[PDB]
Nucleic acid binder design. Structure first.
Ligand SMILES: [K+]
Ligand SMILES: [K+]
Ligand SMILES: [K+]
Ligand SMILES: [K+]
Ligand SMILES: [K+]
Ligand SMILES: [K+]
Ligand SMILES: [K+]
Ligand SMILES: [K+]
Ligand SMILES: [K+]
Ligand SMILES: [K+]
Ligand SMILES: [K+]
Ligand SMILES: [K+]
Ligand SMILES: [K+]
Ligand SMILES: [Mg+2]
Ligand SMILES: [Mg+2]
Ligand SMILES: [Mg+2]
Ligand SMILES: [Mg+2]
Ligand SMILES: [Mg+2]
Ligand SMILES: [Mg+2]
Ligand SMILES: [Mg+2]
Ligand SMILES: [Mg+2]
Ligand SMILES: [Mg+2]
Ligand SMILES: [Mg+2]
Ligand SMILES: [Mg+2]
Ligand SMILES: [Mg+2]
Ligand SMILES: [Mg+2]
Ligand SMILES: [Mg+2]
Ligand SMILES: [Mg+2]
Ligand SMILES: [Mg+2]
Ligand SMILES: [Mg+2]
Ligand SMILES: [Mg+2]
Ligand SMILES: [Mg+2]
Ligand SMILES: [Mg+2]
Ligand SMILES: [Mg+2]
Ligand SMILES: [Mg+2]
Ligand SMILES: [Mg+2]
Ligand SMILES: [Mg+2]
Ligand SMILES: [Mg+2]
Ligand SMILES: [Mg+2]
Ligand SMILES: [Mg+2]
Ligand SMILES: [Mg+2]
Ligand SMILES: [Mg+2]
Ligand SMILES: [Mg+2]
Ligand SMILES: [Mg+2]
Ligand SMILES: [Mg+2]
Ligand SMILES: [Mg+2]
Ligand SMILES: [Mg+2]
Ligand SMILES: [Mg+2]
Ligand SMILES: [Mg+2]
Ligand SMILES: [Mg+2]
Ligand SMILES: [Mg+2]
Ligand SMILES: [Mg+2]
Ligand SMILES: [Mg+2]
Ligand SMILES: [Mg+2]
Ligand SMILES: [Mg+2]
Ligand SMILES: [Mg+2]
Ligand SMILES: [Mg+2]
Ligand SMILES: [Mg+2]
Ligand SMILES: [Mg+2]
Ligand SMILES: [Mg+2]
Ligand SMILES: [Mg+2]
Ligand SMILES: [Mg+2]
Ligand SMILES: [Mg+2]
Ligand SMILES: [Mg+2]
Ligand SMILES: [Mg+2]
Ligand SMILES: [Mg+2]
Ligand SMILES: [Mg+2]
Ligand SMILES: [Mg+2]
Ligand SMILES: [Mg+2]
Ligand SMILES: [Mg+2]
Ligand SMILES: [Mg+2]
Ligand SMILES: [Mg+2]
Ligand SMILES: [Mg+2]
Ligand SMILES: [Mg+2]
Ligand SMILES: [Mg+2]
Ligand SMILES: [Mg+2]
Ligand SMILES: [Mg+2]
Ligand SMILES: [Mg+2]
Ligand SMILES: [Mg+2]
Ligand SMILES: [Mg+2]
Ligand SMILES: [Mg+2]
Ligand SMILES: [Mg+2]
Ligand SMILES: [Mg+2]
Ligand SMILES: [Mg+2]
Ligand SMILES: [Mg+2]
Ligand SMILES: [Mg+2]
Ligand SMILES: [Mg+2]
Ligand SMILES: [Mg+2]
Ligand SMILES: [Mg+2]
Ligand SMILES: [Mg+2]
Ligand SMILES: [Mg+2]
Ligand SMILES: [Mg+2]
Ligand SMILES: [Mg+2]
Ligand SMILES: [Mg+2]
Ligand SMILES: [Mg+2]
Ligand SMILES: [Mg+2]
Ligand SMILES: [Mg+2]
Ligand SMILES: [Mg+2]
Ligand SMILES: [Mg+2]
Ligand SMILES: [Mg+2]
Ligand SMILES: [Mg+2]
Ligand SMILES: [Mg+2]
Ligand SMILES: [Mg+2]
Ligand SMILES: [Mg+2]
Ligand SMILES: [Mg+2]
Ligand SMILES: [Mg+2]
Ligand SMILES: [Mg+2]
Ligand SMILES: [Mg+2]
Ligand SMILES: [Mg+2]
Ligand SMILES: [Mg+2]
Ligand SMILES: [Mg+2]
Ligand SMILES: [Mg+2]
Ligand SMILES: [Mg+2]
Ligand SMILES: [Mg+2]
Ligand SMILES: [Mg+2]
Ligand SMILES: [Mg+2]
Ligand SMILES: [Mg+2]
Ligand SMILES: [Mg+2]
Ligand SMILES: [Mg+2]
Ligand SMILES: [Mg+2]
Ligand SMILES: [Mg+2]
Ligand SMILES: [Mg+2]
Ligand SMILES: [Mg+2]
Ligand SMILES: [Mg+2]
Ligand SMILES: [Mg+2]
Ligand SMILES: [Mg+2]
Ligand SMILES: [Mg+2]
Ligand SMILES: [Mg+2]
Ligand SMILES: [Mg+2]
Ligand SMILES: [Mg+2]
Ligand SMILES: [Mg+2]
Ligand SMILES: [Mg+2]
Ligand SMILES: [Mg+2]
Ligand SMILES: [Mg+2]
Ligand SMILES: [Mg+2]
Ligand SMILES: [Mg+2]
Ligand SMILES: [Mg+2]
Ligand SMILES: [Mg+2]
Ligand SMILES: [Mg+2]
Ligand SMILES: [Mg+2]
Ligand SMILES: [Mg+2]
Ligand SMILES: [Mg+2]
Ligand SMILES: [Mg+2]
Ligand SMILES: [Mg+2]
Ligand SMILES: [Mg+2]
Ligand SMILES: [Mg+2]
Ligand SMILES: [Mg+2]
Ligand SMILES: [Mg+2]
Ligand SMILES: [Mg+2]
Ligand SMILES: [Mg+2]
Ligand SMILES: [Mg+2]
Ligand SMILES: [Mg+2]
Ligand SMILES: [Mg+2]
Ligand SMILES: [Mg+2]
Ligand SMILES: [Mg+2]
Ligand SMILES: [Mg+2]
Ligand SMILES: [Mg+2]
Ligand SMILES: [Mg+2]
Ligand SMILES: [Mg+2]
Ligand SMILES: [Mg+2]
Ligand SMILES: [Mg+2]
Ligand SMILES: [Mg+2]
Ligand SMILES: [Mg+2]
Ligand SMILES: [Mg+2]
Ligand SMILES: [Mg+2]
Ligand SMILES: [Mg+2]
Ligand SMILES: [Mg+2]
Ligand SMILES: [Mg+2]
Ligand SMILES: [Mg+2]
Ligand SMILES: [Mg+2]
Ligand SMILES: [Mg+2]
Ligand SMILES: [Mg+2]
Ligand SMILES: [Mg+2]
Ligand SMILES: [Mg+2]
Ligand SMILES: [Mg+2]
Ligand SMILES: [Mg+2]
Ligand SMILES: [Mg+2]
Ligand SMILES: [Mg+2]
Ligand SMILES: [Mg+2]
Ligand SMILES: [Mg+2]
Ligand SMILES: [Mg+2]
Ligand SMILES: [Mg+2]
Ligand SMILES: [Mg+2]
Ligand SMILES: [Mg+2]
Ligand SMILES: [Mg+2]
Ligand SMILES: [Mg+2]
Ligand SMILES: [Mg+2]
Ligand SMILES: [Mg+2]
Ligand SMILES: [Mg+2]
Ligand SMILES: [Mg+2]
Ligand SMILES: [Mg+2]
Ligand SMILES: [Mg+2]
Ligand SMILES: [Mg+2]
Ligand SMILES: [Mg+2]
Ligand SMILES: [Mg+2]
Ligand SMILES: [Mg+2]
Ligand SMILES: [Mg+2]
Ligand SMILES: [Mg+2]
Ligand SMILES: [Mg+2]
Ligand SMILES: [Mg+2]
Ligand SMILES: [Mg+2]
Ligand SMILES: [Mg+2]
Ligand SMILES: [Mg+2]
Ligand SMILES: [Mg+2]
Ligand SMILES: [Mg+2]
Ligand SMILES: [Mg+2]
Ligand SMILES: [Mg+2]
Ligand SMILES: [Mg+2]
Ligand SMILES: [Mg+2]
Ligand SMILES: [Mg+2]
Ligand SMILES: [Mg+2]
Ligand SMILES: [Mg+2]
Ligand SMILES: [Mg+2]
Ligand SMILES: [Mg+2]
Ligand SMILES: [Mg+2]
Ligand SMILES: [Mg+2]
Ligand SMILES: [Mg+2]
Ligand SMILES: [Mg+2]
Ligand SMILES: [Mg+2]
Ligand SMILES: [Mg+2]
Ligand SMILES: [Mg+2]
Ligand SMILES: [Mg+2]
Ligand SMILES: [Mg+2]
Ligand SMILES: [Mg+2]
Ligand SMILES: [Mg+2]
Ligand SMILES: [Mg+2]
Ligand SMILES: [Mg+2]
Ligand SMILES: [Mg+2]
Ligand SMILES: [Mg+2]
Ligand SMILES: [Mg+2]
Ligand SMILES: [Mg+2]
Ligand SMILES: [Mg+2]
Ligand SMILES: [Mg+2]
Ligand SMILES: [Mg+2]
Ligand SMILES: [Mg+2]
Ligand SMILES: [Mg+2]
Ligand SMILES: [Mg+2]
Ligand SMILES: [Mg+2]
Ligand SMILES: [Mg+2]
Ligand SMILES: [Mg+2]
Ligand SMILES: [Mg+2]
Ligand SMILES: [Mg+2]
Ligand SMILES: [Mg+2]
Ligand SMILES: [Mg+2]
Ligand SMILES: [Mg+2]
Ligand SMILES: [Mg+2]
Ligand SMILES: [Mg+2]
Ligand SMILES: [Mg+2]
Ligand SMILES: [Mg+2]
Ligand SMILES: [Mg+2]
Ligand SMILES: [Mg+2]
Ligand SMILES: [Mg+2]
Ligand SMILES: [Mg+2]
Ligand SMILES: [Mg+2]
Ligand SMILES: [Mg+2]
Ligand SMILES: [Mg+2]
Ligand SMILES: [Mg+2]
Ligand SMILES: [Mg+2]
Ligand SMILES: [Mg+2]
Ligand SMILES: [Zn+2]
Lengths: 154, 110, 59, 101, 116, 140
RNA sequence: CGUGAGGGAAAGGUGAAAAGAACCCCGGGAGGGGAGUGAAAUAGAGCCUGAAACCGUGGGCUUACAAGCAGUCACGGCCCCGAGGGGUUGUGGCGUGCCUAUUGAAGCAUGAGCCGGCGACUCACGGUCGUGGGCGAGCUUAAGCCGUUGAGGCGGAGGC
RNA sequence: GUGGAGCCUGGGAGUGAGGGCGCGAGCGAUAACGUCCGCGUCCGAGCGCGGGAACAACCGAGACCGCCAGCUAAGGCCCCC
RNA sequence: GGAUGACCCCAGGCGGUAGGGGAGCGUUCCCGAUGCCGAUGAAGGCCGACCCGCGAGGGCGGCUGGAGGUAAGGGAAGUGC
């Protein structure tokens, strides 16, 4: 009510008009007036403990290892940045598109070759996070990505 | 077979014109014409025009015999009102509503 | 005086009962003996101008 | 030949071939149940004091159901007290086979 | 985000108005009058379910009284004689016998007469 | 099972002689007959009692000093409009009204009770005009 | 609107495409009835959807001897849908609106003409208890920095 | 004496205008539907139910729901009932 | 009892204002979702004497409407007159 564009004038006198008493037309009881306890700009972030973060990341990867859904790759032989090359490599690797895949690798040419596929989520090793792991059905990582994961959950 | 005619947005109060319409409901066309000619009301002028328009529709458009026509249905619906200011004493402003009517006449065959 | 006002809104049934005497009566009409047109009795015929068996006004 | 029988805390006059709704019985559909007799009438009049010692009525259970829903409403003025409850009374439907007597 | 009223109030009002069908005047057309009428209607139905059992018992007793006095004794003597003989036919079934099987009712009158 | 509901029945015409009866104790018995509560099929919401014919209504008997002390009152709605009539005057001028008034006060109020009062026919003297209906004499 | 400083509204939607209705009929016109367009015209410009209050026409049941917070329970009659049910109400029984404020209200105490929509216990930072987890004589970072473009990590100053 | 009894620790209240009746007192006039205390009770919050013609606190009695079953309470059994 | 809601059995309770506690329904938005439903008809509207729920409600069917709607499981509020 203090931020709407209306003036503070009392619209009609307090007594003897036969109407309800009112102040200014910015009051929330008026149509077009101010809003009571509406939203204001807000910060929703908070500091989750680091140990809980590291424990969560290790559990999420262990969950994929439970089901046999984690695969490690030494190198992507024929993948050099063309989408049809990744598809050929994925077919011989057993990834035919029936399940969603989180692909973690520092190889930029591999990440851009798989990016446009609707069932692939691409991540650099520095970006490994539990929301992306839980979202997808399969986890595919490089050995270089694996080493960064080991260092992170040290 | 039915012949209908509607006059919409006639600037007359529906209550006043409804008194005239009730006089001709169910009558034959010849009796309805005579009644409306000698009814001393403003509304009878408007009702007669709708009745004659409906009679023309029956013969011209719907292959109905004029000698067998009778008023099967007739009613007045209220239209949008015109709101006007009427000044009163001591600076008070009143609102006058100038109402409008939709007049329907439906003819059948006896 | 001290400005009397209605105490309650009139109900739909009560106001329509008050209008139970409002219906119009149709005009009295008789045929004209000369031209057989319907007209009120005891008036000069507006169609042919005859009254009491003689021509009265020009039409 | 008619009888007055006692079931479900209430008394009913029954005849062979009658279809009757009583309180819910712990009997499976299609099974037969026997009802105590308080009075016999018709060809002869036998009056129990309170139960006719030898008589019984043979009834076949047709099925179990729920009665039409009753609205149970409560209101106390000036105290903001309101309660609404739907109630459906269970019942058992019987077919009266014969009156043994 | 903003959650305006939308459709929820209209649907609730329609539920009450459907329950108030057949009520006189604004009691079936205005939600506020209809709700007030239904508060009383619910209390009446609860209370009158209770006294329906007493209304019918009153009807049976009066009818039994008329049938007994056609046999030279009143209702209060008849019920006492039935209890002394150990007969537990209720008033609902006694009233039916008094009107449907008058010859059985004559037999019951004799048992109550002899019991006392 | 549901309670028996009677179907409509032609009603009974009954004749009562009021000679020497106590007024109030006779009126009780009449009210019971008009209500039809002597019938095993009595139903509270229908008119199913007897038509009652009373003769010799002028010869009703009252105890104590009620002839000079019992006062009938009528109110006209005007100022000072309360009229008082002692019983002995009512017996002399309108003998039939005395028994009529006693019975009416013993009937239920409302539309049904008003109809039941219409089924009572009171006459001063020993004759009645209802020979066609053939009322059977009843001892009260 | 106010002499003035100043106050300060309401008002969005045809259709995919105007193809926005030639012509005829009644009519002074308005408006309508046909014709024509369109998948659709109660999409016809007073134009998507089209609730309620409110007004009206037709039909079913009911009502001019009757005492009423308007209902409710019971039975009966009539009409409708097809073992049951729905609509209506003749008679009988029972029955002191809602909210607020009060020791106490049907109250002749307050508020409300009716309907639709707007309308009142929140957030930030501290504190205190409880609770779901993490770690445990320890626990935990802040500002920033690097990295991402809804990816996270580092940072021990400081706090308990 | 095992009870929606008691005690301890902590979180959250609301209330801090009461009223009628009975008994014991003061004030008052051994007046008040008066006022002020004490002991109990009910209304408050049981304007839910039966009786008392009608009627918060008098008599009966503490309403989870259903039944066209039965016994009772205060109060009643000439008609309204 | 069975093995911590698997359902059964036994015992006692279940009027209620201020107020304390518990369990649910519905509204808007987000993840689920490059998914699923939709011109063989979305949302909304008008009906229902049908089904499920103690209830707030939820389904199902007919008509109207003509292009959107959105699950189980969770999250966040401008959340019910
Ligand atoms: K402004
Ligand atoms: K709102
Ligand atoms: K009634
Ligand atoms: K009926
Ligand atoms: K006050
Ligand atoms: K006050
Ligand atoms: K006061
Ligand atoms: K006042
Ligand atoms: K108020
Ligand atoms: K806190
Ligand atoms: K905490
Ligand atoms: K006290
Ligand atoms: K629909
Ligand atoms: Mg401002
Ligand atoms: Mg200001
Ligand atoms: Mg100012
Ligand atoms: Mg300001
Ligand atoms: Mg100022
Ligand atoms: Mg100023
Ligand atoms: Mg002012
Ligand atoms: Mg004032
Ligand atoms: Mg003021
Ligand atoms: Mg005023
Ligand atoms: Mg004024
Ligand atoms: Mg005023
Ligand atoms: Mg005013
Ligand atoms: Mg005002
Ligand atoms: Mg005002
Ligand atoms: Mg106002
Ligand atoms: Mg003011
Ligand atoms: Mg203001
Ligand atoms: Mg302001
Ligand atoms: Mg405003
Ligand atoms: Mg605003
Ligand atoms: Mg404003
Ligand atoms: Mg604004
Ligand atoms: Mg604005
Ligand atoms: Mg505020
Ligand atoms: Mg504010
Ligand atoms: Mg705010
Ligand atoms: Mg705000
Ligand atoms: Mg948070
Ligand atoms: Mg939050
Ligand atoms: Mg932390
Ligand atoms: Mg992708
Ligand atoms: Mg993504
Ligand atoms: Mg007329
Ligand atoms: Mg006029
Ligand atoms: Mg015109
Ligand atoms: Mg014309
Ligand atoms: Mg209209
Ligand atoms: Mg003037
Ligand atoms: Mg003037
Ligand atoms: Mg003037
Ligand atoms: Mg002025
Ligand atoms: Mg002036
Ligand atoms: Mg005005
Ligand atoms: Mg006006
Ligand atoms: Mg108008
Ligand atoms: Mg019209
Ligand atoms: Mg003067
Ligand atoms: Mg004066
Ligand atoms: Mg004057
Ligand atoms: Mg003067
Ligand atoms: Mg005046
Ligand atoms: Mg006045
Ligand atoms: Mg007034
Ligand atoms: Mg008034
Ligand atoms: Mg007033
Ligand atoms: Mg009104
Ligand atoms: Mg009125
Ligand atoms: Mg008025
Ligand atoms: Mg009306
Ligand atoms: Mg009226
Ligand atoms: Mg009037
Ligand atoms: Mg002539
Ligand atoms: Mg049962
Ligand atoms: Mg109820
Ligand atoms: Mg109440
Ligand atoms: Mg009540
Ligand atoms: Mg109350
Ligand atoms: Mg109230
Ligand atoms: Mg009340
Ligand atoms: Mg309240
Ligand atoms: Mg209150
Ligand atoms: Mg109160
Ligand atoms: Mg209360
Ligand atoms: Mg309430
Ligand atoms: Mg409760
Ligand atoms: Mg419930
Ligand atoms: Mg929105
Ligand atoms: Mg809204
Ligand atoms: Mg709404
Ligand atoms: Mg709706
Ligand atoms: Mg309704
Ligand atoms: Mg209705
Ligand atoms: Mg009705
Ligand atoms: Mg009315
Ligand atoms: Mg109505
Ligand atoms: Mg309406
Ligand atoms: Mg309506
Ligand atoms: Mg009420
Ligand atoms: Mg209720
Ligand atoms: Mg009940
Ligand atoms: Mg009761
Ligand atoms: Mg009971
Ligand atoms: Mg009883
Ligand atoms: Mg009767
Ligand atoms: Mg009778
Ligand atoms: Mg005497
Ligand atoms: Mg004497
Ligand atoms: Mg005088
Ligand atoms: Mg005098
Ligand atoms: Mg006088
Ligand atoms: Mg100006
Ligand atoms: Mg200006
Ligand atoms: Mg000026
Ligand atoms: Mg100017
Ligand atoms: Mg100027
Ligand atoms: Mg100003
Ligand atoms: Mg605007
Ligand atoms: Mg549009
Ligand atoms: Mg458009
Ligand atoms: Mg378009
Ligand atoms: Mg299209
Ligand atoms: Mg033309
Ligand atoms: Mg034109
Ligand atoms: Mg034209
Ligand atoms: Mg036309
Ligand atoms: Mg046209
Ligand atoms: Mg087409
Ligand atoms: Mg076409
Ligand atoms: Mg076509
Ligand atoms: Mg349409
Ligand atoms: Mg459309
Ligand atoms: Mg058109
Ligand atoms: Mg439209
Ligand atoms: Mg529009
Ligand atoms: Mg559209
Ligand atoms: Mg529109
Ligand atoms: Mg529409
Ligand atoms: Mg309507
Ligand atoms: Mg409408
Ligand atoms: Mg209306
Ligand atoms: Mg009709
Ligand atoms: Mg009819
Ligand atoms: Mg009448
Ligand atoms: Mg009548
Ligand atoms: Mg009379
Ligand atoms: Mg009446
Ligand atoms: Mg009523
Ligand atoms: Mg009611
Ligand atoms: Mg009923
Ligand atoms: Mg009648
Ligand atoms: Mg009645
Ligand atoms: Mg009655
Ligand atoms: Mg009554
Ligand atoms: Mg009252
Ligand atoms: Mg009361
Ligand atoms: Mg209320
Ligand atoms: Mg107040
Ligand atoms: Mg209060
Ligand atoms: Mg007060
Ligand atoms: Mg208060
Ligand atoms: Mg209080
Ligand atoms: Mg006081
Ligand atoms: Mg008032
Ligand atoms: Mg007043
Ligand atoms: Mg008043
Ligand atoms: Mg005040
Ligand atoms: Mg106020
Ligand atoms: Mg109101
Ligand atoms: Mg008002
Ligand atoms: Mg207001
Ligand atoms: Mg109003
Ligand atoms: Mg006003
Ligand atoms: Mg209204
Ligand atoms: Mg409203
Ligand atoms: Mg409003
Ligand atoms: Mg609106
Ligand atoms: Mg607003
Ligand atoms: Mg805030
Ligand atoms: Mg928050
Ligand atoms: Mg805090
Ligand atoms: Mg804190
Ligand atoms: Mg604390
Ligand atoms: Mg904890
Ligand atoms: Mg930790
Ligand atoms: Mg801990
Ligand atoms: Mg994210
Ligand atoms: Mg303690
Ligand atoms: Mg709390
Ligand atoms: Mg505490
Ligand atoms: Mg609290
Ligand atoms: Mg406190
Ligand atoms: Mg306080
Ligand atoms: Mg204190
Ligand atoms: Mg204080
Ligand atoms: Mg104090
Ligand atoms: Mg005080
Ligand atoms: Mg005081
Ligand atoms: Mg006390
Ligand atoms: Mg005290
Ligand atoms: Mg006492
Ligand atoms: Mg006392
Ligand atoms: Mg005392
Ligand atoms: Mg005392
Ligand atoms: Mg004392
Ligand atoms: Mg003392
Ligand atoms: Mg004292
Ligand atoms: Mg003394
Ligand atoms: Mg005293
Ligand atoms: Mg008092
Ligand atoms: Mg006192
Ligand atoms: Mg003391
Ligand atoms: Mg004391
Ligand atoms: Mg004390
Ligand atoms: Mg005391
Ligand atoms: Mg106490
Ligand atoms: Mg107490
Ligand atoms: Mg107490
Ligand atoms: Mg009590
Ligand atoms: Mg208490
Ligand atoms: Mg009480
Ligand atoms: Mg009370
Ligand atoms: Mg109260
Ligand atoms: Mg009361
Ligand atoms: Mg109270
Ligand atoms: Mg008592
Ligand atoms: Mg009492
Ligand atoms: Mg009483
Ligand atoms: Mg009485
Ligand atoms: Mg009394
Ligand atoms: Mg009382
Ligand atoms: Mg009372
Ligand atoms: Mg008491
Ligand atoms: Mg109780
Ligand atoms: Mg029970
Ligand atoms: Mg007994
Ligand atoms: Mg006793
Ligand atoms: Mg007792
Ligand atoms: Mg009796
Ligand atoms: Mg309990
Ligand atoms: Mg209760
Ligand atoms: Mg209890
Ligand atoms: Mg409770
Ligand atoms: Mg959003
Ligand atoms: Mg989310
Ligand atoms: Mg999001
Ligand atoms: Mg499909
Ligand atoms: Mg459709
Ligand atoms: Mg939506
Ligand atoms: Mg829908
Ligand atoms: Mg729909
Ligand atoms: Mg539904
Ligand atoms: Mg959506
Ligand atoms: Mg969704
Ligand atoms: Mg809000
Ligand atoms: Mg709500
Ligand atoms: Zn002529």
């Amino acid at each position: 009510r203090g931020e709407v564009a209306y003036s503070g004038r009392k619209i009609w006198p307090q007594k003897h008009t036969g109407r309800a008493r009112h102040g200014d037309i910015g009051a929330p009881i008026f149509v077009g007036g101010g809003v009571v306890f509406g939203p204001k700009p807000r910060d929703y972030s908070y500091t989750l403990p680091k140990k809980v973060r590291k424990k969560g990341l290790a559990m999420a990867v262990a969950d994929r290892a439970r089901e046999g859904k984690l695969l490690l790759v030494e190198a992507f032989a024929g993948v050099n940045g063309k989408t049809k090359e990744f598809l050929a490599w994925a077919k011989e690797a057993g990834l035919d598109g029936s399940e969603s895949v989180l692909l973690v690798t520092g190889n930029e040419l591999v990440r851009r070759a798989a990016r446009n596929l609707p069932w692939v989520v691409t991540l650099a090793p520095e970006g490994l996070n539990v929301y992306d792991i839980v979202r997808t059905e399969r986890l595919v990582m490089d050995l270089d990505a694996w080493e960064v994961f080991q260092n992170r959950i040290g | 077979m039915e012949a209908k005619a509607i006059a919409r947005y006639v600037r007359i109060s529906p209550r006043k014109v409804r008194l005239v319409v009730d006089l001709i409901r169910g009558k034959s066309l010849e009796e309805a014409r005579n009644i409306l000619r000698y009814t001393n009301k403003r509304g009878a002028y408007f009702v007669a025009k709708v009745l004659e328009s409906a009679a023309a529709n029956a013969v011209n458009n719907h292959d109905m015999l004029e000698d067998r026509l009778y008023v099967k249905a007739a009613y007045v619906d209220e239209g949008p009102a015109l709101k006007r200011v009427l000044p009163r004493a001591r600076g008070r402003a009143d609102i006058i509503k100038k109402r409008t009517s939709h007049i329907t006449v439906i003819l059948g065959e006896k | 005086a001290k400005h009397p006002v209605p105490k309650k809104k009139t109900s739909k049934a009560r106001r329509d009962a008050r209008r139970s005497h409002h219906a119009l009566t149709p005009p009295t009409l008789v045929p004209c003996p000369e031209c057989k047109a319907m007209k009120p009795p005891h008036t000069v015929c507006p169609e042919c101008g005859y009254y009491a068996g003689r021509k009265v006004l020009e039409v | 030949m008619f009888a007055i029988v006692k079931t479900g805390g209430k008394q009913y006059r029954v005849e062979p071939g009658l279809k009757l709704r009583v309180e819910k019985l712990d009997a499976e559909p299609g099974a037969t149940v026997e009802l105590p007799v308080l009075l016999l009438g018709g060809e002869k009049t036998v009056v129990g004091t309170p139960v006719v010692e030898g008589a019984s009525v043979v009834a076949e259970v047709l099925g179990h159901g729920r009665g039409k829903k009753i609205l149970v409403s409560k209101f106390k003025a000036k105290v903001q007290y309101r309660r609404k409850k739907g109630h459906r009374q269970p019942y058992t439907e019987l077919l009266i086979k014969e009156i043994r007597g | 985000p903003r959650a305006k009223t939308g459709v929820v109030r209209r649907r609730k009002h329609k539920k009450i108005l459907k329950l108030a069908k057949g009520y006189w005047g604004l009691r079936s057309k205005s939600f506020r009058k209809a709700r007030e009428t239904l508060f009383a209607a619910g209390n009446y139905a609860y209370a009158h379910r209770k006294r329906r059992k007493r209304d019918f018992r009153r009807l049976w007793i009066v009818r039994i009284n008329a049938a007994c006095r056609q046999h030279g004794l009143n209702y209060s003597t008849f019920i006492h004689g039935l209890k002394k003989a150990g007969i537990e036919v209720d008033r609902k079934n006694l009233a039916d016998l008094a009107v449907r099987e008058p010859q059985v009712f004559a037999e019951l009158v004799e048992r109550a007469k002899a019991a006392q | 099972m549901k309670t028996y509901v009677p179907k409509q029945v032609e009603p009974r015409w009954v004749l009562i002689d009021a000679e020497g009866k106590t007024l109030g104790r006779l009126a009780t018995k009449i009210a019971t007959l008009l209500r039809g509560k002597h019938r095993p099929d009595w139903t509270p919401n229908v008119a199913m009692g007897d038509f009652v014919v009373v003769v010799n209504a002028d010869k009703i008997r009252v105890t104590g000093k009620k002839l000079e002390q019992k006062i009938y009152t009528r109110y006209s709605g005007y100022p000072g409009g309360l009229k008082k009539i002692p019983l002995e005057k009512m017996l002399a001028t309108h003998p039939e009204r005395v028994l009529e008034h006693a019975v009416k006060g013993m009937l239920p109020k409302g539309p049904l009770g008003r109809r039941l009062f219409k089924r009572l026919k009171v006459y001063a003297g020993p004759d009645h005009p209802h020979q066609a209906q053939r009322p059977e004499k009843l001892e009260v």
